[PDB]
Amino acid sequence: MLQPPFNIKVTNITLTTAVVTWQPPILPIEGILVTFGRKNDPSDETTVDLTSSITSLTLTNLEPNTTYEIRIVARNGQQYSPPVSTTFTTGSLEHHHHH
Amino acid sequence: MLQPPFNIKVTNITLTTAVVTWQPPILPIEGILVTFGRKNDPSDETTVDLTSSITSLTLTNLEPNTTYEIRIVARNGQQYSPPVSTTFTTGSLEHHHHH
Amino acid sequence: MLQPPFNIKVTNITLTTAVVTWQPPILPIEGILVTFGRKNDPSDETTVDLTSSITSLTLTNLEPNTTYEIRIVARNGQQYSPPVSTTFTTGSLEH
Amino acid sequence: LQPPFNIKVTNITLTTAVVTWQPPILPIEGILVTFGRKNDPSDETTVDLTSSITSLTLTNLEPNTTYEIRIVARNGQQYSPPVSTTFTTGSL
Amino acid sequence: LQPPFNIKVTNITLTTAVVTWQPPILPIEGILVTFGRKNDPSDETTVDLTSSITSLTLTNLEPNTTYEIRIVARNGQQYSPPVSTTFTTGSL
Amino acid sequence: MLQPPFNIKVTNITLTTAVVTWQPPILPIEGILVTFGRKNDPSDETTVDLTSSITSLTLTNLEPNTTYEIRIVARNGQQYSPPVSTTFTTGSLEHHHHH
Amino acid sequence: MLQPPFNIKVTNITLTTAVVTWQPPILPIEGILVTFGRKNDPSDETTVDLTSSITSLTLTNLEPNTTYEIRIVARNGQQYSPPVSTTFTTGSLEH
Amino acid sequence: MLQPPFNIKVTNITLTTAVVTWQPPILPIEGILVTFGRKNDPSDETTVDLTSSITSLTLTNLEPNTTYEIRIVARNGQQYSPPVSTTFTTGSLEHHHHH
Amino acid sequence: LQPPFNIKVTNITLTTAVVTWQPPILPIEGILVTFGRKNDPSDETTVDLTSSITSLTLTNLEPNTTYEIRIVARNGQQYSPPVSTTFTTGSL
Incomplete structure (x- = not known):
């Protein structure tokens, strides 16, 4: 199998x-x-x-x-490596919206 | 990139x-x-x-x-060539079955 | 201890x-x-x-x-059937 | 049709x-x-x-x-004029 | 329960x-x-x-x-009929 | 003291x-x-x-x-000779398994 | 005769x-x-x-x-501690 | 000349x-x-x-x-690539020590 | 003075x-x-x-x-408590 990408990191997560x-x-x-x-x-x-x-x-x-959810795959020609992935959640609002 | 296999041909299709x-x-x-x-x-x-x-x-x-459907791909080194493919349908039951 | 294949035949032998x-x-x-x-x-x-x-x-x-020579072995899990064989000979050049 | 802008290049290394x-x-x-x-x-x-x-x-x-970096915005077949910047990598 | 077959006695010497x-x-x-x-x-x-x-x-x-050589298959309690072959050793 | 079997040889190794x-x-x-x-x-x-x-x-x-690993032991009465053994490794595949 | 390492652990094992x-x-x-x-x-x-x-x-x-398998040996001068080991297995492909 | 290692990153810095x-x-x-x-x-x-x-x-x-400071260099044949480096400072003692 | 550990008896035969x-x-x-x-x-x-x-x-x-197997470490005069393990040989 084609070698995959590794050590995936999701950083600086904002709203x-x-x-x-x-x-x-x-x-x-x-x-x-x-x-x-x-x-x-x-x-x-x-x-x-x-x-x-x-x-x-x-x-x-x-x-x-x-x-x-992010998925990252390496591609060589038309061969694809298994994915490397992770999940993350965006920040939220503590105060409410308009009116 | 890698040159793919070619002239795919399905033959002698039966049931x-x-x-x-x-x-x-x-x-x-x-x-x-x-x-x-x-x-x-x-x-x-x-x-x-x-x-x-x-x-x-x-x-x-x-x-x-x-x-x-049949897909035929060639592989060399760490590369897969694009596939050469084709589809076919098996024969069918003209007269009916048993009882 | 594992089921084997059989009746291996070699046809349409050419050069x-x-x-x-x-x-x-x-x-x-x-x-x-x-x-x-x-x-x-x-x-x-x-x-x-x-x-x-x-x-x-x-x-x-x-x-x-x-x-x-052709040998065929069936596998299931980590079990392998006893090999089945047959041999054949490709045709010879005329000239 | 506009393109991006304010194109910055940073953390330039070797x-x-x-x-x-x-x-x-x-x-x-x-x-x-x-x-x-x-x-x-x-x-x-x-x-x-x-x-x-x-x-x-x-x-x-x-x-x-x-x-040199040239960035262009597309919409199927309509490309905007390119925006471009140039930078140089660190030296020994 | 099926027995072995094609019993063959090969490379016979003295x-x-x-x-x-x-x-x-x-x-x-x-x-x-x-x-x-x-x-x-x-x-x-x-x-x-x-x-x-x-x-x-x-x-x-x-x-x-x-x-004469006889071979029989088994599954603890069940056996199969035998399979037999006979051969002769060299003489000089 | 009961001489063991010897000259053990593994040959014709295949898959x-x-x-x-x-x-x-x-x-x-x-x-x-x-x-x-x-x-x-x-x-x-x-x-x-x-x-x-x-x-x-x-x-x-x-x-x-x-x-x-293969070990061969000689038995006479209730006595057993030390074993004589050897090691070997079956051939391996070069093409992959299926999906 | 030479002090050895120990407590070898293998974590975050992926494919x-x-x-x-x-x-x-x-x-x-x-x-x-x-x-x-x-x-x-x-x-x-x-x-x-x-x-x-x-x-x-x-x-x-x-x-x-x-x-x-991983083996670790500590060295000091021309002395080498007795090897310490552990083994681990990388994950398997899903598809 | 030889291409150097890259994206050096210090992480999880403690005391x-x-x-x-x-x-x-x-x-x-x-x-x-x-x-x-x-x-x-x-x-x-x-x-x-x-x-x-x-x-x-x-x-x-x-x-x-x-x-x-950390320097990371690649070597091949009889060549060393230029180094990719970075510096970092370990954490510090907020409250004081013993007696 | 520390003794050996993880004593293991492996490849047991007759x-x-x-x-x-x-x-x-x-x-x-x-x-x-x-x-x-x-x-x-x-x-x-x-x-x-x-x-x-x-x-x-x-x-x-x-x-x-x-x-039973006992093992003890020493430094000429000082010994360590023993480390023990027991095993049984094959039978047939």
Whole structure:
């Protein structure tokens, strides 16, 4: 099997954003595929294709006090490695909205 | 990137069996991966790892009047080539069964 | 102690080609190991792991007028049936 | 059709750089980020991202070298004029 | 309960012989092998083996003598009919 | 003091079978005990009781790329000679299993 | 005759990753040899020489569902403590 | 010249311990050299030679409120790549000690 | 003075057994190993070894018999309390 990305980390979690970083495999690979979206929600899922030379992404437009799930895969040609993933929840509001 | 196998051809289709045969990519390779199952079910899938000197497989124990898909990919080093695929449907029961 | 395959037949033998066919075991199994290579050479062997849903293979790139042996072993869990064999010889060059 | 702006490059090291940019001001179908040696039009790597992404960490760059980043916003077939910046990696 | 088949006595010399057999179609918890001079009931020996063993080499046989080998499969209580073969050792 | 069997030799090793052969001690004995199984394992051990007439066995149902230990003991009356043993490893696969 | 390390623990085991941790010897030493490789393979082994000021390593690029062994030896002058061991197994592939 | 290791990152800093983790250069290499010690003393230095498949070290027995520097270099053939380095300072004693 | 620990009796057969142990936390100038039938004081043998030896194989044991093994560390004059384990040989 193709070696996967490892040590995935979601940092600087705010109300609507998050910083995702990971470590690519030891072997040369042609791409990385980062997939994210609401955890308990299949449909909502965005996928990004990157050169293995990118090790971090900052996400915005996330919804508050919501649980997300990120999945990262290495790609070499058309062979894909098992994913490496994690879940995280965005911060929430303690004071209420308008009127 | 890696050149894929080609000229996939399903032959001698009956009620429960099919003959699959293809051509390995011209460049030397470490293996050929054949995947098959109901086109109607990503779960129902089997993938075999063959030498490149095997160019044909006879599939038995297939369900009558069912539609199947075959994916054939080549692998070398740590790369899979894109797949060459095709679909076919098994023969059917003209006259009816027993009692 | 594990159900074996049987009735291995080799047909349509040409100069460098051969069709191999067999009968899956009576009891269900998880896989089937098919090994082949020159009979003379204990170090030539090539093995592929298949399922019982596959009962035939076409071998190519063989050498002319050579004797090959095929061995099939069925596997289930960590159990392996006693090997079943047969040998055949590819055709010879005319000129 | 506008592009991003305020493109900042940071934590520049011998071989890596954090690229950040402020999204335009129009619901767009993402952007394209291209980077490569500035003194070499042959070396160009492109990535296609949705609007939601505002930063990337670039690696495998060469020391004491000048790189150029061109970001373009797309909407199917309508590309905005590119925004660009150039920076140089740390030196020995 | 199916017995072994294709019993074969190979590499026969003046005092030794190789015995091999193909295990049954159905799994078996064990096998009993018996051998001795065909024309003699007193001289007869048997060994119980695991079905995973498929060949055995006999030594110290008498020259130019005919021997019979019987093999039976078992599952503790159930046995199968025997499978037999006979052979003769070299003479000079 | 009861001379043990000797010159034990494992030959014809394959993915799942192996041939074992030896020589009985010089003086007659009541039986020969051949015990075999995975080396790194106590639960897995098969003992077979032979007549000193037998000098070889062909073992099947061996796991691929696995290390095995074989011990042979001579028994006369209630006495047992120290065992003579050897180790070997079955051949291994180069192509993968299926899915 | 030389003080040994101990309490080797392996945590955060993934498909190809593993965190190894240990306790340096009671008496001071000059170095610590940490060896690792597949347990099955006596010829796989990889060794690094560390100091007692380091008590943990993260191994990567391992193979899935495989059993590895770690051995640690403390050295001082030309003396080497008796090896301390532990084994662990990387996770298995789902699909 | 040789591409250096990158994304050096010190983490989990306490009074006496620190976690160091980095990314090996993409090209195959024979080794990674990690050097650490008080930034305040070129004499106080330790250099370990690691496989490139080790991407993290936990340093213990560090002095409280001290500033340290880490240099990570890659070596291949008979070349060392330039170093990737960073500094950090251990935590400190808030309340006072014993008597 | 700390004794060895984790005494383990491995590969037990009809007449042999493998004995291994993990040397102490503190260095020791030597080790004394004793073994013999558990229910018998007359039958008992001891060997003095260098602490660098960690395993030993016993042969000529009696079948289906229980044995006890004691190990003690020393520094010429000081010894440590013993560490013990017992095992039984195969039977048939």
